[PDB]
């Protein structure tokens with residue numbers, strides 16, 4: 001047999017984190033020969049000092065290794081796929097984590113239009129006393145919904161605003 | 166000496182309750198002769214079954230009495246002065262409780278105008294990427310402030326909304 005790299009996640013690959021909280025993406029993996037070019041990537045951007053790598057055993061015959069990425073104070077926009085890559089002289093290997101960041105809806109108004117953004121997808125109710133877009137600027141949220149006929153909410157929170165003529 | 170009614174509060178007369186929470190307004194009082202016409206009043210409205218009255222002692226020579234008003238699920242609008250009255254054949258006596266209900270700001274928008282309402286008095290900040298009125302209808306809050314130049318907040322919460330042209 002030749003070289004090999006086998007990766008096992010220590011936590012579930014799909015993780016859910018509340019807005020402003022932390023999460024540690026942990027991976028164990030066996031490799032021969034000595035693993036090289038350990039790397040954590042999010043959005044073509046490489047984390048320089050937010051992660052750590054170390055052998056699981058001090059013993060010389062160890063081929064078990066651990067890599068951890070420390071995500072701190074995650075924002076709703078910082079949700080997405082975080083990828084870990086590693087290689088040796090023979091094999092290239094990778095594993096991916098899907099990080100969801102729960103956020104309460106942010107609503108804006110520009111005949112006005114009410115637009116809610118966040119995760120999970122905010123639903124809009126109207127009380128008396130629908131399309132989907134994807135924008136970078138305000139309001140800041142993973143999923144964006146506009147309702148026309150303003151209260152907005154999801155399983156993590158609610159946001160309201162009144163409008164009169 | 167003739168008749169007398171002396172009232173002592175068992176809790177502080179000024180009470181602060183968060184929105185949606187409960188509070189028990191408790192009063193002890195000594196009276197001779199037998200107290201009569203015990204009454205709890207808020208906004209000219211008399212609580213019929215939300216309160217209880219009972220002698221502090223079963224013994225016959227007791228002149229000590231207790232009256233409790235159970236306020237449940239208080240709203241921001243339900244903040245104000247709650248009054249307890251009691252009398253006998255000689256004296257009339259009363260005591261008053263000042264109930265504050267903390268609420269996060271509610272903001273509305275009608276050249277638009279942003280109006281925040283709640284308790285304590287909401288302050289308005291503007292981020293780039295003042296008068297005072299008193300209305301019954303939306304937005305619902307004890308103190309109302311309009312700022313013109315929309316984020317709004319107080320020591321109990323915050324509420325935001327964007328506006329673009």
Ligand SMILES: *[C@@H]1O[C@H](CO)[C@@H](O)[C@H](O)[C@H]1NC(C)=O
Pocket residue numbers: 012013014015016
């Ligand atoms: C995914 O991870 C969660 C914990 O965040 C766990 O409750 C769930 O069972 C996992 N799903 C699997 C292992 O299929």
Ligand SMILES: *[C@@H]1O[C@H](CO)[C@@H](O)[C@H](O)[C@H]1NC(C)=O
Pocket residue numbers: 177178179180181
């Ligand atoms: C008023 O009541 C509060 C408790 O709600 C207490 O902390 C405060 O000391 C009281 N003020 C007095 C007794 O003057």
Ligand SMILES: [Co+2]
Pocket residue numbers: 049050051052
């Ligand atoms: Co380091």
Ligand SMILES: [Co+2]
Pocket residue numbers: 121
């Ligand atoms: Co949808």
Ligand SMILES: [Co+2]
Pocket residue numbers: 214215216217
């Ligand atoms: Co009763």
Ligand SMILES: [Co+2]
Pocket residue numbers: 286
């Ligand atoms: Co003021």
